C-alpha cells in the first residue's frame, strides 16, 4: 500500500463520533445505515450481501484503498452516484488521516 499510517489510537475516537453513527467496524457486525466496515481494506465495494445495496455501487466497482477511499469520504454521492451514504463529506483532511488509520488497522 502507498499511504503509510498516522495513529492507530485518536482515528478510533474520529471514527466513533463520525462513522459509527451509521457503520460498525466489527467482525460482521450490523448493517445498521450503512453496511460493515470490516476486511474492507483491499475488498471490492459491495462485499456485503443481503444489507440495502445499490447498482451504482456494483457498477462503480472500487477496491477500498486508502486514495479511493479518502477520496470517497469527501463525496460519496458523488463517487457513488447511488447511495444512501447521506453523510456530511469528510471535509476536515486532517482528521481523515487519523481515521483511515484506525480504519486501515481495524480491518486488517
Ligand atoms: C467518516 C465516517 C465514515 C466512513 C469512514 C464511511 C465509510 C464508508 C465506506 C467505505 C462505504 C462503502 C461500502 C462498500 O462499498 O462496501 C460506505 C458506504 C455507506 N455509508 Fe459510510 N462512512 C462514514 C460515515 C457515514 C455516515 C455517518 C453515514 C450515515 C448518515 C453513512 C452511511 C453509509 C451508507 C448508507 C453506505 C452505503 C452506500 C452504498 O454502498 O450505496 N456513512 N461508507
Ligand atoms: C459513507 N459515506
Same mark, same amino acid.
Given at each position: 500500500?502507498? %499511504?503509510?499510517?498516522?495513529?492507530?489510537?485518536?482515528?478510533?475516537?474520529? %471514527?466513533?463520533?463520525?462513522?459509527?453513527?451509521?457503520?460498525?467496524?466489527?467482525?460482521?457486525?450490523?448493517?445498521?445505515?450503512?453496511?460493515? @466496515?470490516?476486511?474492507? %481494506?483491499?475488498?471490492?465495494?459491495?462485499?456485503?450481501?443481503?444489507?440495502?445495496?445499490?447498482?451504482?455501487?456494483?457498477?462503480? $466497482?472500487?477496491?477500498?484503498?486508502?486514495? $479511493?477511499?479518502?477520496?470517497? @469520504?469527501? $463525496?460519496?454521492?458523488?463517487?457513488?452516484?447511488?447511495?444512501?451514504?447521506? %453523510?456530511?463529506?469528510?471535509?476536515?483532511?486532517?482528521?481523515?488521516?487519523? @481515521?483511515?488509520?484506525? @480504519?486501515?488497522?481495524?480491518?486488517?
Amino acid at each position: 500500500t502507498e %499511504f503509510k499510517a498516522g495513529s492507530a489510537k485518536k482515528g478510533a475516537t474520529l %471514527f466513533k463520533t463520525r462513522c459509527l453513527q451509521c457503520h460498525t467496524v466489527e467482525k460482521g457486525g450490523p448493517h445498521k445505515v450503512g453496511p460493515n @466496515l470490516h476486511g474492507i %481494506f483491499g475488498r471490492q465495494s459491495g462485499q456485503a450481501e443481503g444489507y440495502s445495496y445499490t447498482d451504482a455501487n456494483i457498477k462503480k $466497482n472500487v477496491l477500498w484503498d486508502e486514495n $479511493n477511499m479518502s477520496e470517497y @469520504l469527501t $463525496n460519496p454521492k458523488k463517487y457513488i452516484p447511488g447511495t444512501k451514504a447521506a %453523510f456530511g463529506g469528510l471535509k476536515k483532511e486532517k482528521d481523515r488521516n487519523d @481515521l483511515i488509520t484506525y @480504519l486501515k488497522k481495524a480491518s486488517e
